[PDB]
């Protein structure tokens, strides 16, 4: 028993404050019309490998550094360059107040508008039912990609979230964006300030999910965007046999601010100049522990004027380390 | 005893599923003529640092992510880029069948044609006496570098390996390459379908080794290539004092497909227009545990028409950690 | 207990020779005149994340591989590319002789002339009170950035460091630079050989600190550069509540070689065409364990001819993993 203890103690020397996690993904995307996912083609098979380091700076602060690498199956034009996707420090100023600083992931509202990289600061105040999240910074991925410091609109976001029921939650959000460059239909246009505001709901009872979100720019005409979805399943990547099915509908207008949505819709501000309106059915199945298989079929895609867009379909495998 | 276990649990809370290995290399290469290794010069001293993360997704699957960085001693034009060299998932479908998916390392035959990065899928059926390996994908390195997905020649490879006696192994392979752009003597030229079939043998007894390989494209004339080598030693980088010496003759014709050979000759389809034929003597010595000094000298280098080529020589330090 | 013993051994299987450390910095720099820190702007808010893998090749050798990623808050033109900052091997040939090989950090003398990346070899002979350091290689960062191998000036450095008390140490250094391209005021000018020689001294009685450094090129005229500073504090980033204040003065002539100094003056060989002469006050405070807030204000900046220069000021937060 004593010797074993010593053999434990030596391990305590080698292990540090950094825990290494990560994930891998092999994805296939396709559409009935060329150009939706890859230029001058109607298919795209790619892969991604992310390695994350969670470091315990001390007992009240932690940092996260994520290194990602994307590649296409057969694309040898350039090497799979490694990029720092996440680099931020998280502080716990008590049992309620929390803070984040650096390049982290921000979700503007319910994720329909933005659920991706964010350069700036974030604050969180709330115990168990009411949570106020306040972020200040700049968007990175999505239609806000390719902009410089002077040309990148600054987001001031405040979001209220309330826990109604056991695992159901409602909420709202109010964001203000300064004038800056945004990617509309493949061209960078300098847009004025916007006052986006929105509401969302997510009711989940015993393997039945019903979610919805509606956002609108206060000072921009025909700029609202909403989504509504239902689903059944108990998906969890860490347990075998856990599946999930869901069907949702997206109706977003021409001027609706959709930089990089959380959902796997193929049409957003970057792709469409006259809105998007259509359904999408997604299926997930944990084939093994920490190995999940996802499929998705987006159909009935149309513009806001009835013009018929192109369908799309995805199939991906995600491995969690 | 309960406390000790708690300690172990804390270690299991921090160690995770990712094991970090890696290696480093300090290499010098030279030749008697300019342009063999570095443009407009006859020497190249460089270094490489690779860090590999091996993650146990579950009992029957693991993933590998390798971050590689090359640099040249004194070259400060660009920072040492970090590139995702390997990113793949390995599945064990029982005691015999195994599968690989993603960006891995493929060895087409004995390694003379290609032993390097590969984007696609691999399926191994093993019996500890006879092994079958089938790969479908794209070459990423060597003469296949600089190609897009629409120009990269797809490879469909099937290889058999028979373990004759103990530690000795023979084998063969048949591969089909689709039409695509290949780098012939620095010029990207489009080539039609090719059928590369070959055999190899590797007889190791006591401390002596004798190997050979022969491959040929069925529908292309003047594409036959082969190598034959003899060596003596017991090299193992993790064991100090283990040495090794070998001498091998390479004879590859003008149109022989040699994308990225597993050996260290400096002439493979990318810097030759009329073939290669010559000897190469290599020496290895584990100076310390996990440290190895390798040297090589390639001489009698000639084209297939009798015209002389440039001799070359290498000296490298490999640190394994 | 046998069940526990199997677990602990498993940990030793999943814990290799690589220990992962790192740091994360969030920095703000600014000046009263545009262009000191960023083009056409008098401010720069950036962040950096470094992850270092310290390996143990064996009991007498150890390698280091550092992956560094910089970004600017709001700059989305390019991803935060990961660069291999350090990649080298450290050998320990007894209790008095040590060596390094690869891309490491070199401090030429006291660091006023250069303390940054270095490609080459280093040898150390130390009597535990008198140390001799000899480095042969190339500069990679600072005014030597953007140079190829054929243009990078080779550096042959021999430095001596003696201890004259409990903490106070004096020393000197002699370095030889070959002909090469160096960045003077944004223009890459070719310069002949230089024979830099210099001295430095440091005294750390109690918490007081008094440091100084002088250096000059033997053949070039108007190349003398010196710094002298005082301070009081016990700054240790791993201890909460440890503060530090200091104030120093720099006097750098027009042709004084300041490639990448170890101090934080905003003016060096890359920014100054007629030298620099001014004061700088720095403050450090470890607000938390492994967290530190640093501030700096450089004022009275002037050319060697009396022409006024801009005043600079910075504030940063450093977290050690």
Catalogue all structural domains in chain C, each as residue range(s) with its CATH number.
2-320 (2.40.160.10)
Torsion of CA B231, B236, B242, B248, to 10 degrees: 20
Q: Are C296 and C318 in contact (CB under 8 A)?
A: no
Q: Nearest CA to CA, how far is C17 from chain B (Å)?
A: 6
Residues 6+ apart with CB under 8 A from A168: A201, A202, A203, A204, A205
3-state SS assignment for residue B152: coil
Plot region of B228 (φ>0 → left; ψ -120 to 50 → alpha; else → beta): beta
Q: Are A216 and A197 in contact (CB under 8 A)?
A: yes
| CA C128 – CA B304 distance, rounded (Å) | 62
Residue B165: how many other CB atoms lie within 10 Å = 10
Q: Are A112 and A262 in contact (CB under 8 A)?
A: yes
Q: Is A218 exposed, middle or buried (0-12, 13-18, 19+ CB in 10 A)?
A: exposed
| CA B54 – CA B67 distance, rounded (Å) | 12
Comparing CA positions, the residue from B157, C82, B269, B259 lying closest to residue A79 is C82
Name the residue facing C74 among A8, A57, A138 (closest C-beta): A138
Q: Which residues of B touch C144 (CB under 8 A)?
A: 76
Only one residue has tokens 């140079």, namely: C147
Rounded to the nearest angstrom, the gap between the alpha carbon of residue B264 and the centroid of all alpha carbons in its chain is 10
3-state SS assignment for residue B294: strand
Q: Which residues of B touch C148 (CB under 8 A)?
A: 74-77
Cβ pairs A/C, distance under 8 A = 140
| CA C321 – CA B12 distance, rounded (Å) | 19
Cβ distance of B57 and A290 shorter than 8 Å: yes
SS (HEC) of chain A: CHHHHHHHHHHHHHCCCEEEEEEEEEEEEEECCCCCCECCECEEEEEEEEEEEEEEEECCEEEEEEEEEEEECCCCCCCCEEEEEEEEEEEECCCCCEEEEEEEEEEECCCCCEEEEEEEEEEEECCCCEEEEEEEEEECCHHHCCCCCCCCCEEEEEEEEEECCCCCEEEEEEEEECCEEEEECCEEEEECCEEEEEEEEEEEECCEEEEEEEEEECCCCCCCEEEEEEEEECCCCCCCCCEEEEEEEEEECCCCCCCECCCCCCCCCCCCCCCEEEEEEEEEEEEECCEEEEEEEEEEEECCCCCECCCEEEEEEEEEC
Q: Is C3 exposed, middle or buried (0-12, 13-18, 19+ CB in 10 A)?
A: exposed
3-state SS assignment for residue B270: coil
Q: Which residue of A has its CA nearest to C83?
A: A82
| CA B248 – CA B212 distance, rounded (Å) | 9
For the record, the structure tokens of A23 come out as 């994930």
Q: Which residue of B has its CA nearest to A1?
A: B1
Q: Nearest CA to CA, how far is B232 from chain A (Å)?
A: 38
DSSP classification of residue B167: T
Q: Which residues of C touch B21 (CB under 8 A)?
A: 16-18
Subunits adjacent to chain C (3 or more Cβ pairs under 8 Å):
A, B
Only one residue has tokens 């159909």, namely: A299
Residue C16: how many other CB atoms lie within 10 Å = 17
Cβ distance of B14 and A12 shorter than 8 Å: no
Cβ distance of A71 and B1 shorter than 8 Å: no
Name the residue facing C73 among A15, A67, A119 (closest C-beta): A119
Q: Which residues of B touch A10 (CB under 8 A)?
A: none
Interface test with A, best of B7, B21, B55 (most A CBs within 10 A): B55
Only one residue has tokens 């009991």, namely: C59
Name the residue facing C55 among B19, B82, B321 (closest C-beta): B321
| CA B318 – CA B292 distance, rounded (Å) | 5
| CA B246 – CA B253 distance, rounded (Å) | 23
Q: Which residue of B has its CA nearest to C148?
A: B75
Q: Are C57 and B290 in contact (CB under 8 A)?
A: yes
Subunits adjacent to chain A (3 or more Cβ pairs under 8 Å):
B, C
Q: Which residues of A touch B60 (CB under 8 A)?
A: 288
Q: Which residues does a chain break follow in chain B (C to N more than 2.5 Å)?
A: none
Q: Pairing relation of β-strands C82-92 and C61-72? A: antiparallel
Q: Which residues of B touch C55 (CB under 8 A)?
A: 22, 321
Cβ pairs A/B, distance under 8 A = 140
Interface test with C, best of B74, B77, B237 (most C CBs within 10 A): B74
| CA A259 – CA A180 distance, rounded (Å) | 13
Measured CB to CB, residues of chain B less than 8 Å from chain C are 1, 4-5, 8, 11-12, 15-17, 19-22, 24, 26, 41, 47-49, 51, 67, 69, 71-77, 79-82, 288-291, 317, 319-321
Q: Which residues of A touch B1 (CB under 8 A)?
A: 1
Q: Nearest CA to CA, how far is C294 from chain A (Å)?
A: 17
| CA A170 – CA A203 distance, rounded (Å) | 8
Q: Are A79 and A48 in contact (CB under 8 A)?
A: no
Cβ distance of A76 and B18 shorter than 8 Å: no
């Amino acid at each position: 028993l004593n010797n074993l203890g010593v053999r434990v103690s030596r391990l305590e020397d080698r292990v540090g404050n950094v825990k290494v996690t990560g994930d891998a993904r092999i994805r296939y995307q396709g559409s009935e019309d060329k150009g939706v996912y890859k230029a001058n083609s109607k298919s795209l098979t790619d892969g991604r490998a992310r390695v994350q380091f969670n470091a315990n700076v001390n007992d009240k602060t932690q940092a996260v550094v994520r290194v990602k690498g994307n590649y296409e199956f057969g694309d040898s034009t350039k090497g799979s360059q490694a990029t720092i996707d996440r680099a931020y420090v998280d502080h716990k100023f008590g049992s309620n107040v929390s803070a984040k600083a650096g390049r982290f992931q921000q979700t503007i509202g319910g994720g329909l508008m933005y659920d991706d990289t964010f350069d700036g600061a974030q604050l969180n105040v709330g115990n168990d039912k009411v949570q106020v999240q306040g972020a200040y910074g700049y968007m990175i991925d999505g239609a806000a990609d390719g902009n410089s410091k002077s040309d990148n609109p600054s987001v001031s976001y405040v979001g209220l979230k309330g826990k109604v029921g056991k695992e159901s939650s409602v909420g709202g959000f109010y964001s203000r964006l300064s004038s800056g460059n945004l990617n509309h239909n493949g061209v960078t246009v300098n847009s004025d300030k916007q006052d986006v505001y929105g509401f969302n709901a997510d009711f989940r009872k015993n393997k039945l999910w019903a979610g919805g979100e509606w956002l609108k720019a206060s000072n921009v005409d025909n700029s609202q965007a909403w989504t509504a979805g239902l689903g059944y399943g108990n998906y969890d990547i860490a347990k075998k046999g856990t599946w999930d099915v869901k069907g949702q509908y997206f109706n977003q207008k021409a001027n609706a601010p959709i930089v990089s949505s959380t959902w796997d819709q193929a049409y957003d501000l970057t792709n469409t100049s006259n809105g998007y309106k259509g359904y999408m059915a997604s299926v997930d199945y944990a084939v093994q522990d920490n190995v999940g298989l996802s499929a998705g079929y987006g159909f009935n895609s149309k513009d806001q004027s009835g013009n018929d867009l192109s369908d799309f379909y995805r199939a991906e495998l995600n491995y969690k380390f």
